């Protein structure tokens, strides 16, 4: 109440795994620049992959 | 003209000019997690000279 405060959570991490692909299929990737008008932060919110 | 001596008649100077390919170019910029892209082709030249 006043002199003793009980247990109370502070923070929380929800950590996830990645998105897999095929080993034998072979990745081919190239870097492109963003389109700035799109809200790119909206796409990257959730921790689940 | 400091003097010099030889035993033969005619004097041939053969100059070999060399324009090596100059080490130019910057490394290409990319993002981590990408397949690389190759470099351009450069040229070296050799010319000679007779006197």
UniProtKB/Swiss-Prot annotation, chain A:
Protein location: Virion
Superkingdom: Viruses
Job description of the protein: Cooperatively binds the expanded capsid, thereby stabilizing the mature capsid shell and allowing the large viral DNA to be packaged. Trimers of capsid decoration proteins molecules are located at local and icosahedral threefold axes and stabilize the expanded capsid, which shows increased spacing between capsomers.
Subunit structure: Homotrimer. Interacts with the major capsid protein.
Name of the protein this chain belongs to: Decoration protein
Organism lineage: Viruses, Duplodnaviria, Heunggongvirae, Uroviricota, Caudoviricetes
UniProtKB/Swiss-Prot annotation, chain B:
Signal peptide as annotated in the record: none
Top-level lineage group: Viruses
UniProt-annotated location(s): Virion; Host cytoplasm
Membership in a protein family: Belongs to the lambda phage major capsid protein family.
UniProt subunit comment: Homomultimer. Interacts with the portal protein. Interacts with the decoration protein.
UniProt function note: Assembles to form an icosahedric capsid shell with a T=7 symmetry although with a diameter of about 82 nm, which is a larger volume than the usual T=7 capsids. A dramatic reconfiguration of the capsid shell that expands the procaspid from a diameter of 66 nm to a supersized capsid of 82 nm, allows packaging of the large viral DNA genome. The capsid decoration protein binds the expanded capsid and stabilizes it.
Name of the protein: Major capsid protein
Classification lineage: Viruses, Duplodnaviria, Heunggongvirae, Uroviricota, Caudoviricetes
Residues of the full protein shown: 53 to 103 of 409
């Amino acid at each position: 109440m006043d002199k003793v405060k009980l247990f109370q959570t502070i923070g929380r991490v929800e950590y996830w795994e990645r998105v897999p692909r095929l080993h034998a299929y072979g990745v081919f990737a190239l870097p492109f620049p963003m389109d700035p008008d799109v809200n790119w932060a909206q796409w990257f919110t959730g921790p689940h992959p | 003209f400091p003097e010099d001596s030889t035993f033969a008649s005619e004097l041939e100077l053969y100059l070999l000019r060399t324009q090596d390919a100059e080490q130019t170019g910057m490394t290409f910029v990319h993002q981590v997690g990408s397949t690389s892209l190759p470099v351009e082709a450069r040229v070296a030249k050799v010319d000679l000279a007779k006197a």
